[PDB]
């Protein structure tokens, strides 16, 4: 009866070759994993809906399905497309037919009950004859022939694919693209179709197409190999939104949820009287244009479809509105300006027009809303002897304002002379007339013109169109229409006290806040029905295709379900246990993929909770330490792009360039900004790396006290003398539109030489090469100074020198192992590359946009259209592409500022971390800084920060001071500790107890002042 | 535009994590507040609030004060979580000095910690102990004065209030732009659509689309620039946290004017004090 | 920025008064809107760079 | 190109390749080489050679 559809409904949307690209297209496709009807029967079929397009598929072994019928009645009464394959060729006809039996075609061929006539044919096509399977066979099917049948604007598009199969059961799973084959211009309104079966079995599938958006993957050979149905599910929406088939772990915003209306609400005043249009259009006599009439039409039901459909009118031109929308709109008042004019003067009755009537007798506003209605009256107002009862004002000393009625009869003066009702030179009358006779010319015949002026709704409306009202439903999302004002939202009761004259309320945005119900004068608030963005929480597609959906800022009762302050989270199980944050949701909630396995949501942990065993006489002092190496990765530079604004916008087009010149310096200001950026990328690089006045090199003998630097020093065997670690870093980070990339000034080899010099200086001369000359020093002694710099006596290093070197070497090895396996380690630098690449890919894609033009391709506009019309379309494209460049450049300037700040920070670290020793906490890594080593990286720098971290501690009893002979002895830069029986003095950051003597302590004051002073003895050497 | 705004929203949480999430563990003070006479009751959490914030933090929070496609996302770190981080940083500073920043938190008497801070400015530790009671009273009085100042002068937090105002002003302007015609017959799209039909309506709509899109581009650009300013401030705040609270700063006027001893963080709306 | 005032931006003339003194509102308003759009975009660019 | 395909396209929707209408072979279209030209010069206060 039914089966599960699969990845079979994909066809080539057009005939353009694309390869190695993911292309997003919207067309009528079969939704993935939808239900498709299975029609089987062994030992005619029904008439099916076409549903704006039909997916059809069949499995064959003997060519049982041999044709299709498409139409409305499909019975010799309308044109109906008939496609038949009768062992010779495909025959397509749209002829009528008498189906004097349940049509099917029988098997060689010995039966033909499909038809017995051919009458009133308007199209016939026959392909070349072939020969195929006809005799009776039964079993597994051998050939699956899939088809798509769609009707677009009268064109019947047929797509198909034939493929070998070895399968009797349901549809095979597997991607297969459908090529286009036929486009038939027929123009038939198709609502139903039927199939044709061959009787000596039955097997075929019928699906239906829907307006889905698909993301199509074209491989290197231009064959469609996959597709994503966006509205299939949140994961598919995410993949198409990001235009990729792989989604990294995280949360993405892909769409917006909106509760849809369930029913419409149409509300109008309960008026039964009809508007007296007949008394104006069929008036016995029209007024003269010098004295035009204004009839008010109000408190009635108006129907403008009668006037519009009537063919008796010579013109019906609406300004501001248009004639088929007038039925759903209503007005506070409509006024009818009624007068007779000359035919040739109809053009003057319009906004923006001038002339002796437009200026002297009937002026319209240039913002006029309404309709100009006209018809000739040559058989009513014109008379033999002429009709001289219609007067117009020939002369006036001034023009007229809109809707002014100038009834005055003052004597007009051409020049300047007194007139007192006299007809004389420069004493003329403003009143003139025409003598209209049925025999006068076309332009001299009378026309009856009525202009209907509509005053936009503001106040309660009384003259409304023929739309009937409905009942009102509160507290539900509805699509409402109140007196022509439309929108979607939930209508609720309100406490807004509208004044008796007020009809509408407004929000800050001028949107409707509340309405007065036109039937019952109560005030209803309009709150649009709940909506919000929808985010998809997913582990990467390299792990699982299971996702959770977050509906932002909604309640869960308006749609496992977890209510959070971020929204309603669907698909994630709520876990009481806290963990480290993984994929953030918001409001303290994070999600992760963990174990059966599922996506979980939890309140994030801030770290383990602990307490410090504080007391007024207890100090913890470390007895051992660890040397750790951390990696700090900073962007320094970004790719130095340069864009030819002219070639991008106006590629190889003189006409476009000439139009572009009317926009001035916009281009050169973009070239200037990008040049400035490109230059500053090199300034940034020089400031970070060119901090050494000379190029230093290490000695051939690497006698550095056991410290192994072979993985950070250049390896004299590479085409570019980079270290092992640098090679690892470089192995982790991965045009004809006026878009170029400039090379950097400093090549990678030169950067490596600078980092080599900085490293060799640091190793052989410590910090001295930074301040001035490089002064050689044994490395172990350099470390001794670095230890003194953190309050640790140099003797600690020498005594543990071998241990320290091994820890250092091991730490370096661990970095290498980390860098060799974890690609994400350099994400901070990879993102910069991605951001610049994304910016360019977007920019290039903008060239495909129309921006309102007929075509995105400039040459296609130019080769078909000529300048007076072509220039407008080109200006539209220029505006769009120029705005795109302005956006790109602005984003690059902001990003460049971010990079500059990072480069300045990197230079600061280089100066304070590598050339010196930093006293700034966590500036040169967490811990007590010893030394740092630079390594170069693509568009960036990596610092290896060597830090001293206390490793093991004991609880010792302490005291701020010791009493001896009543004098208070305090330690000379150390602390007092007790092992329970004896007091010792020791350095703060490393347990090394010494006997308390007068050379370790100093005396100030006496025992009665110091809080916590203890009794002891002080040894005097 | 959605991408740019998402990037901003994300970086606001990165900024918060970098400023506050500088401690690997959540520390808590002992039940006995024997800190040598130094009174911290106005900066430590008060175990009685719906959100365990200090008195001063409550004062700070009491001073700082949609259907058009405009939404506000919640922060990842709620105010309670921020308070827990500041509590941990404060407890670490008090009970272990700077040791919790470099590595493990090593307990030390507070008076001795101050002795080290005094040595760090070239003042022998004996000065503190001999004047320890005086110093504690001065500290306690100074804290009380802060409370009195914060309790009466609303303008004290103007630097943070302006940020709120700038974002609010930006949105109010943006929403108001929907009322503009931009050359169209009406700013209301539905009123154009219900009276005019496609060959003429599409032009008026394109005019409104152009105007509203330009308005968004302007808003987003201003937000990106403002966000860069905020990021610089957050980086500075993180730097101070690292050098002022976790350590002791030798940088003149970096951690206030005078010779720096110690600093204490307090959370505030969209900021740190 | 000042030089941008000399640009037509598709208008018949960069000088606003020359448009206004020869053309009347139903046609003049379009040319003026073209100049307003261009000059406003120029200011937006200037302010952003500043 | 598949037998029904006549044109190829680039990311920008520009033509990548064409099927020759007289002989059905596929030809790639690569715009002829172009690029910016920069002038390296000492200041005109020294020399006019570039
Ligand atoms: C200090 O810690 C280091 C390790 O960080 C200790 O060295 C380890 O000592 C054990 C002895 O039990 C050896 O088995 C390990 O192989 C050593 N590790 C390394 C890397 O050499 C050192 O002994 C500790 N010292 C003290 C006094 O506790
Ligand atoms: C510094 O460490 C490197 C680590 O690779 C040592 O080089 C290794 O040396 C051993 C023998 O000494 C070889 O068996 C390995 O194959 C080498 N590895 C590589 C990657 O070359 C180097 O010898 C150490 N330096 C010193 C002075 O011992
Ligand atoms: C505290 O340290 C002292 C100094 O090392 C310890 O004293 C000595 O103890 C050893 C036996 O462990 C004797 O052989 C020495 O002669 C002692 N010397 C002195 C000067 O007393 C003392 O035992 C330690 N106390 C604890 C509890 O560990
Ligand atoms: C340190 O030792 C001195 C004397 O050796 C202690 O002072 C004595 O204090 C007790 C109790 O107050 C008196 O009874 C003695 O007469 C005092 N003797 C002298 C010489 O002053 C002092 O109290 C001790 N410190 C502590 C903390 O107990
Ligand atoms: C630290 O200072 C606070 C200041 O408020 C002290 O709490 C006050 O304590 C006194 C009595 O000790 C009460 O009368 C006040 O009402 C308290 N004020 C508040 C706001 O609670 C606190 O006791 C001081 N700490 C110590 C150890 O003395
Ligand atoms: C297939 O159709 C049946 C009813 O005909 C329906 O209950 C079922 O849910 C459909 N399949 C899917 C996957 O929705
Ligand atoms: C199929 O129909 C065509 C119609 O012209 C006919 O010529 C052909 O012979 C038929 N095929 C047979 C009889 O196998
Ligand atoms: C078909 O042909 C007949 C000729 O007898 C003609 O009268 C009729 O109008 C034509 N059209 C239809 C739809 O029957
Ligand atoms: C097609 O025919 C149906 C009647 O079956 C009718 O309702 C529909 O409006 C027709 N389509 C057109 C475009 O007239
Ligand atoms: C593309 O065609 C070539 C034939 O030269 C073939 O070797 C290659 O595997 C094909 N690629 C795909 C993805 O089918
Ligand atoms: C006014 O509207 C109500 C709503 O149902 C209707 O019953 C009433 O008859 C209307 N008034 C007139 C005069 O028709
Ligand atoms: C005018 O009168 C004619 C008949 O003389 C009638 O058919 C027409 O509908 C009338 N028009 C109006 C607006 O009353
Ligand atoms: C991601 O995919 C690659 C190749 O499919 C695989 O080697 C890698 O282990 C995957 N990632 C994880 C975390 O397993
Ligand atoms: C919606 O959220 C409110 C918030 O207080 C809650 O009280 C209510 O029960 C939730 N569910 C509904 C309205 O169905
Ligand atoms: C988690 O805690 C809640 C307390 O509100 C409790 O109702 C729930 O059953 C707990 N779940 C588990 C698995 O412990
Ligand atoms: C110090 O003493 C406290 C007392 O409870 C203990 O919890 C803590 O672990 C001790 N420190 C070490 C390093 O063992
Ligand atoms: C430490 O605190 C205890 C409280 O149990 C007190 O008796 C002792 O005198 C205090 N010592 C110092 C030095 O403050
Ligand atoms: C530049 O020109 C001025 C005046 O012509 C001259 O004095 C100056 O020396 C020139 N610069 C150099 C580097 O000679």
Q: Taking CA A183 as the corner, what is the angle to CA A180 and CA A187, rounded to the nearest 5 degrees?
A: 145
Tokens 């003052």 locate to A410
Binary contact (D7, A18; C-beta < 8 A) = no
Whether residue A664 lies within 8 A of chain C, CB to CB, comes out as: yes
- Size (chain A), residues: 1021
Alpha carbon distances (Å) from A211 to A28, A29, A182, A218, C14 = 4, 6, 21, 21, 48
Q: Which residues make Cβ contacts (< 8 Å) with residue A155, sequence separation at least 6? A: A183, A184, A185, A186
Classify A264 as helix, strand or coil: strand
Radius of gyration in angstroms for the set of CA atoms belonging to chain A, rounded to a whole number: 44
What span, in angstroms and rounded, lies between the C-alpha atoms of A637 and D26? 41
Pairing outcome for strands D26-28 and A105-106: unpaired
Query: B198-240 vs B158-176: helix axis angle to the nearest 10?
Result: 170
Q: Which residue has 């004065």 as its token pair?
A: B145
φ/ψ of residue A923, rounded to 5: -75, -40
Q: Is A607 left (phi over 0), alpha (psi -120 to 50) or beta?
A: left
B105-B107-B113-B119 Cα dihedral, nearest 10 degrees = -70
- What lies within 8 Å, CB to CB, of A135 at 6+ separation is A62, A107, A108
How is chain A split among helix, strand and coil, in percent rounded to 5?
A: 20, 35, 45
> Do β-strands A10-11 and A192-199 pair in parallel, antiparallel, or remain unpaired?
unpaired
Task: Of A2, A9, A14, A3, give the one whose Cα is nearest residue A53.
Answer: A9
Q: How far is CA A34 from the centre of its chain?
A: 28
Region label for A851, one of left (φ > 0), alpha (ψ between -120 and 50) or beta (otherwise): left
CA B88 from centre of chain? 16
Cα B205 → chain centroid: 42
The alpha carbon torsion through C31, C34, C40, C46 (nearest 10 deg) reads -110
Contact A537, A549 (CB under 8 A): yes
What's the rounded Cα separation, in Å, for the pair B236 and B254?
10
How far apart (Å, rounded) are the C-alpha atoms in residues A839 and A638?
12
Terminal CA-CA length for chain A: 106
User: Could you tell me the two tokens for D38?
Assistant: 């920069």
Contacts of A595 (CB under 8 A, 6+ apart): none
End-to-end CA distance of chain D: 49
What tokens were used for A504?
């509408």
Distances (CA, A) of C13 to A463, A872, A874, B263, C24: 47, 17, 20, 65, 15
Asked if residues A174 and A7 have their Cβ atoms less than 8 Å apart, the reply is: yes
User: Are β-strands A940-959 and A105-106 bridged in parallel, bridged antiparallel, or unpaired?
Assistant: unpaired
Q: With beta carbons less than 8 A apart as the criterion, state whether A1018 and A998 touch.
A: yes
Closest CA to A994 of A1017, A975, A1014, A1009: A975
Cα dihedral sign, A817-A821-A823-A825: negative
| Ligand 10 midpoint to CA A163 (Å) | 19
A352 phi-psi bin (left φ>0, alpha ψ -120 to 50, beta other): left
Phi/psi at A650 (5° precision)? -125, 60
Question: A115 with A152: CB under 8 angstroms?
Answer: no
The reply to whether D6 touches chain A by the CB within 8 Å rule is yes
Q: What residues pair up with A978 in beta bridges, in sequence order?
A: A957, A983
Q: Quick one: CA dihedral B104, B110, B112, B115, positive or negative? A: positive
- Please name which of A755, A718, A714 lies closest in space to residue A942, comparing C-alpha atoms: A755
* Joined tokens for residue B49: 């609030």
Place of tokens 């004060």: B65
Task: Return the CATH number at A60.
Answer: 2.60.120.960
| Cited resolution, angstroms | 3.1
Give the up-direction half-sphere exposure of residue A193: CA atoms within 13 A in the CB hemisphere: 25
Structure token digits, residue A956: 């010792």
Tell me the CA distances in angstroms from B176 to A509, B60, B190, B218, D25, one per residue in order: 5, 31, 17, 14, 59
Q: Which residue blocks in A90-172 are alpha helix, DSSP H?
A: none
Say how far residue A460 (Cα) sits from the centre of its chain.
Answer: 41
Count the Cβ atoms, other than its own, within 10 Å of residue A172.
14
CA distance A621 to A624: 9
Cα B201 to Cα A712, B180, B182, B184, C27: the distances in Å are: 68, 17, 14, 10, 20
Task: Give the number of residues written for chain C.
Answer: 50
- Written as six digits, the tokens of B152 are 């009466």
Q: Check residue D22 and report its DSSP letter.
A: S
- The binding-site residues of ligand 5, defined as CB within 6 angstroms of any ligand atom, are B 39, 41
d(CA B31, CA A183): 85
Residues A872 and A864: their CA atoms lie apart, in Å, by 14
CB contact under 8 A, A607 and B26: yes
Residue B193 is encoded by which pair of tokens? 């659509």
Residues 182-241 of B with CB under 8 A from A: 185, 187-188, 190-191, 193-197, 200, 206, 217, 221, 224-225, 228, 231-232, 239
Residue closest to A886 by CA, chosen among A839, A852, A854: A839
**How many residues are there in chain D?**
50
Describe chain C by its helix, strand, coil percentages, rounded to 5: 70, 0, 30
Answer yes or no: do A619 and B106 touch at CB < 8 A.
yes
Q: How many Å lie between the alpha carbon of C21 and the closest alpha carbon of chain B?
A: 22
Q: How buried is A353 (Cβ within 10 angstroms: 0-12 exposed, 13-18 middle, 19+ buried)?
A: middle
In the block, residue with structure tokens 């920070």 = A905
| Domain boundaries, position A162 | 2-258
SS3 D17: strand
d(CA A486, CA A528): 12
Structure tokens belonging to residue A464? 């409304």
Q: What b/e sequence results for A652-691 when a residue is b if at least 16 CB atoms lie within 10 Å of its CB, and e otherwise? A: ebeebbebbebbbebbebbbebbeebbebbeebbebbbeb
CB contacts, 8 Å: A329 with chain B: 194-195
Task: Encode burial over C26-47: b for 16+ CB neighbours within 10 A, e otherwise.
Answer: eebeebbebbebbbebbebbee
Neighbours of chain A (3+ CB pairs under 8 A): B, C, D
CA–CA gap between residue A531 and residue A534 (Å, rounded)? 9
A461 half-sphere exposure, CB direction, 13 A CA radius: 29
Phi, psi for residue C9 in degrees, rounded to 5: 55, 25
Rounded distance between C-alpha atoms, residue A875 and residue A381, angstroms: 51
- d(CA A3, CA A833) in angstroms, rounded, equals 47
Chain B residues in contact with A509 by the CB 8 A cut-off are 68, 175-176, 178-179
Structure tokens at A355: 């002339």
How far apart are the CA of C19 and the nearest CA of chain B, in angstroms?
A: 19
Token pair, residue A977, equals 């500790």
Within A846-919, residue ranges assigned H as helices are: 858-862, 867-909
Structure tokens at A965: 């002979």
Which residues sit directly before a break in chain B (C to N > 2.5 Å)?
65
Q: Are A935 and A942 in contact (CB under 8 A)?
A: yes
3-state helix, strand, coil in chain B (%, to 5): 60, 5, 35
- Residues in chain B closer than 8 A to A588 (CB atoms): 76-78, 80-81
Cβ contact A659–C10 (<8 Å): yes
A845 touches chain D (CB under 8 A): yes
- 8 A C-beta contact, residue A342 and residue A444: yes
> Rounded to whole angstroms, how far apart are CA atoms A328 and A471?
17
Cα A67 → chain centroid:
45
Count chain B–chain C contacts defined by CB atoms under 8 A.
3
DSSP B242: I
Strands (E) across A685-725 are located at none
Helix (H, G, I), strand (E, B) or coil at A83: strand
Q: How close A893 gets to chain C, by Cα (Å)?
A: 9
Q: Which two tokens stand for residue B168?
A: 């609010």
CA distances from A300 to A293, A304, A308, A461, A712 (A): 20, 13, 18, 10, 92
Contact A933, A760 (CB under 8 A): no
């Amino acid at each position: 009866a039914y089966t599960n559809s699969f990845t079979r409904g994909v066809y080539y949307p057009d005939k353009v070759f694309r390869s190695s690209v993911l292309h997003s297209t919207q067309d009528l496709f079969l939704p993935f994993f939808s239900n498709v009807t299975w029609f089987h029967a062994i030992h005619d079929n029904p008439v099916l809906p076409f549903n704006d397009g039909v997916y059809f598929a069949s499995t064959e072994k003997s060519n049982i399905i041999r044709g299709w019928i498409f139409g409305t009645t499909l019975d010799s009464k309308t044109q109906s497309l008939l496609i038949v394959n009768n062992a010779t060729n495909v025959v397509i006809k749209v002829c009528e037919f008498q189906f004097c039996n349940d049509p099917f075609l029988g098997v060689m061929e010995s039966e033909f009950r499909v038809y017995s006539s051919a009458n009133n044919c308007t199209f016939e096509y026959v392909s070349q004859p072939f020969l195929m399977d006809l005799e009776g066979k039964q079993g597994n099917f051998k050939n699956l022939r899939e088809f798509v049948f769609k009707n677009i604007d009268g064109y019947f598009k047929i797509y198909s694919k034939h493929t070998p199969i070895n399968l009797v059961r349901d549809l095979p799973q597997g991607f297969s693209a459908l090529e286009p084959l036929v486009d038939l211009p027929i123009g038939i309104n198709i609502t139903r179709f039927q199939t044709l079966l061959a009787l000596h079995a039955a097997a075929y599938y019928v699906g239906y197409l829907q307006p889905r958006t698909f993301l199509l993957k074209y491989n290197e050979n231009g064959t469609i190999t996959d597709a994503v149905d966006c509205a299939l599910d949140p994961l598919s929406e995410t993949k198409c939104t990001l235009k990729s088939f792989t989604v990294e772990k995280g949360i993405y915003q892909t769409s917006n949820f909106r509760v849809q209306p369930t029913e419409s609400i149409v509300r109008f005043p309960n008026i039964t009287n009809l508007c007296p249009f007949g008394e104006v259009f069929n008036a016995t006599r029209f007024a003269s244009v010098y004295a035009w009439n204004r009839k008010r039409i109000s408190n009635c039901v108006a129907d403008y479809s009668v006037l519009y459909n009537s063919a008796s009118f010579s013109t019906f031109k609406c300004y501001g509105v248009c004639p088929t929308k007038l039925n759903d709109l209503c007005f506070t008042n409509v006024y009818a300006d009624s007068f007779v004019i000359r035919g040739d003067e109809v053009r003057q009755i319009a906004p923006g027009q001038t002339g002796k009537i437009a200026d002297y007798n009937y002026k319209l506003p240039d913002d006029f809303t309404g309709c100009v209605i006209a018809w000739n009256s040559n058989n009513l107002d014109s008379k033999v002897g002429g009709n001289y009862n219609y007067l117009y004002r020939l002369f006036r000393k001034s023009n007229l304002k809109p809707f002014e009625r100038d009834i005055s009869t003052e004597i007009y003066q051409a020049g300047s002379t007194p007139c007192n009702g006299v007809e004389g030179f420069n004493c003329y009358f403003p009143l003139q007339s025409y003598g209209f006779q049925p025999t006068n010319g076309v332009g001299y015949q009378p026309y009856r013109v009525v202009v209907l002026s509509f005053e936009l709704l503001h106040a309660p409306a009384t003259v409304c169109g023929p739309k009937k009202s409905t009942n009102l439903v509160k507290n539900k999302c509805v699509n409402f229409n109140f007196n022509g004002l439309t929108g979607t939202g939930v209508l609720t009761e309100s406490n807004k006290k509208f004044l008796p004259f007020q009809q509408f309320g407004r929000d800050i945005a001028d949107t409707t806040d509340a309405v007065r119900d036109p039937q019952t004068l109560e005030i209803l608030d309009i709150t649009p029905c709940s909506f919000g963005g929808v985010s998809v929480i997913t582990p990467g597609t390299n792990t699982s295709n299971q996702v959770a959906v977050l509906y932002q800022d909604v309640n869960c009762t308006e749609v496992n379900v977890f209510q959070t302050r971020a929204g309603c989270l669907i698909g994630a199980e709520h876990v009481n246990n806290s963990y480290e944050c993984d994929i953030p949701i918001g409001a303290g909630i994070c999600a992760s993929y963990q174990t059966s396995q599922s996506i979980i949501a939890y309140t994030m942990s801030l770290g383990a909770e602990n307490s410090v065993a504080y007391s007024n006489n207890s100090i913890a002092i470390p007895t051992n330490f660890t040397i750790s190496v951390t990696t700090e990765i900073l962007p320094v530079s970004m790719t130095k792009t340069s864009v030819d604004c002219t070639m991008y916008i106006c590629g190889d087009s003189t006409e476009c360039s000439n139009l572009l010149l009317q926009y001035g310096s916009f281009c050169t200001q973009l070239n200037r900004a990008l040049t400035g950026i490109a230059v500053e990328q090199d300034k940034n690089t020089q400031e970070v790396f060119a901090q050494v006045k000379q190029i230093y090199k290490t000695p051939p003998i690497k006698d550095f006290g056991g410290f192994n630097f072979s993985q950070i020093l250049p390896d004299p065997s590479k085409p570019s003398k980079r270290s092992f670690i640098e090679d690892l870093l470089f192995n982790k980070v991965t045009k004809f539109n006026g878009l170029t990339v400039l090379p950097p000034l400093l090549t990678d080899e030169m950067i490596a030489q600078y980092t080599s010099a900085l490293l060799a200086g640091t190793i052989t001369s410590g910090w001295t090469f930074g301040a001035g000359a490089a002064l050689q020093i044994p490395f172990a002694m350099q470390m001794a100074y670095r230890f003194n710099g953190i309050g640790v006596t140099q003797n600690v290093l020498y005594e543990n020198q071998k241990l320290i070197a091994n820890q250092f070497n091991s730490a370096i090895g661990k970095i290498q192992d980390s860098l060799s396996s974890t690609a994400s380690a350099l994400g901070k630098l990879q993102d910069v590359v991605n951001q610049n690449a994304q910016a360019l890919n977007t920019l290039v894609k903008q060239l495909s946009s129309n921006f309102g033009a007929i075509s995105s391709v400039l040459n296609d506009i130019l080769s078909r259209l000529c300048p007076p019309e072509a220039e407008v379309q080109i200006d539209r494209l220029i505006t769009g592409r120029l705005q795109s460049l302005q956006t790109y450049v602005t984003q690059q300037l902001i990003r460049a500022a971010e990079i500059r700040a990072s480069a300045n920070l990197a230079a600061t670290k280089m100066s304070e971390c590598v050339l010196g020793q930093s006293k700034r906490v966590d500036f040169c890594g967490k811990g007590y800084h010893l030394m740092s080593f630079p390594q170069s990286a693509p568009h960036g720098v990596v610092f290896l920060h060597v830090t001293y971290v206390p490793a093991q501690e004991k609880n010792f009893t302490t005291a701020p001071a010791i009493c001896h002979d009543g004098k208070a002895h305090f330690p000379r830069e150390g602390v007092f500790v007790s092992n329970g029986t004896h007091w010792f003095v020791t350095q703060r950051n490393f347990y090394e107890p010494q006997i308390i003597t007068t050379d370790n302590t100093f005396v100030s004051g006496n025992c009665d002042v110091v809080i916590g002073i203890v009794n002891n003895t002080v040894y005097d050497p």
